[PDB]
């Protein structure tokens, strides 16, 4: 760090963020060069596909839940101005 | 007798010709699990058996088929699994066997000896200090 050269050039510098300083980064700055964590902007059409799948799972769970609920409420009745 | 033919022009091999059509192994997670088990089969037989040190960096063979031990005509009284004993995956079988108690005890032991004094101990010293 005392023998850097300021005008290096790479290709990483075309494809990573930079550390920078507190000046532009803020409270939250060590001089780490971040990367990804793994996930990206996942574009819309695939997201719709995800949503449909999640819908299917949730509806089917509502199915099993309602069957269970009706059975349990029935059994709750069978456990426990009406007569004229 | 002679007709017009069909033209049908539209990587590594997939069924090995010189081993009677063993297909390329599909990568499914339970299969991966079984492979990990058979590599680490040493520690499974904790104490009583030892094994040939099969050591490649990878462990997945390119060609393998999950199968079934069929039958012993000369012996089926005790070399036959019971109906409850039969399992889908080898990992669930070695689960459903005994001695997983001894596994868990060894687990708590090794876990403690890697939690010897690394950070929790330093924190408690720090409490004995700051008090």
């Amino acid at each position: 760090a005392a023998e850097r050269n300021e005008d290096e050039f790479y290709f990483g510098m075309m494809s990573r963020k930079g550390p920078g300083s507190a000046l532009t980064r803020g409270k939250g700055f060590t001089g780490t060069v971040d990367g990804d964590r793994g996930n990206k902007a996942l574009s819309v059409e695939t997201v719709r596909l995800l949503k449909t799948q999640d819908l299917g799972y949730v509806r089917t769970m509502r199915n099993i839940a309602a069957k269970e609920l009706k059975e349990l409420e029935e059994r709750y009745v069978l456990a426990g101005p009406k007569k004229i | 007798e002679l007709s017009v033919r069909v033209p049908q022009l539209p990587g590594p091999p997939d069924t090995l010709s010189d081993w009677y059509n063993i297909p390329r192994t599909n990568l499914t997670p339970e299969l991966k699990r079984d492979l990990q088990l058979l590599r680490m089969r040493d520690v499974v037989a904790m104490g009583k058996q030892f094994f040939k040190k099969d050591n490649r960096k990878d462990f997945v063979p390119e060609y393998c088929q999950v199968g079934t031990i069929i039958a012993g005509a000369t012996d089926g009284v005790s070399g036959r699994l019971t109906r409850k004993e039969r399992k889908r995956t080898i990992v669930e079988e070695v689960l459903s066997s005994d001695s997983v108690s001894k596994y868990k005890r060894k687990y708590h032991e090794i876990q403690e000896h890697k939690k010897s004094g690394r950070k929790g101990y330093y924190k408690k010293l720090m409490a004995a200090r700051k008090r």
Binding site: T52, V58, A65, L69, Y76 | -
Partner: protein, 54 residues
Amino acid sequence: EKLARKVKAARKKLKALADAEYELELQQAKMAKTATSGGFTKSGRRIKVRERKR
């Protein structure tokens, strides 16, 4: 009392999953390929477009 507690938890389960079903349908609305009314924005504006899906 025990069965009643079980029914209370079960009805909570039904209500939560139902609200989830509502959320998923309205999400399909918000990201649908054309315009379509429905739900709110984050500011609470209940969406309304009289335009019809042709």
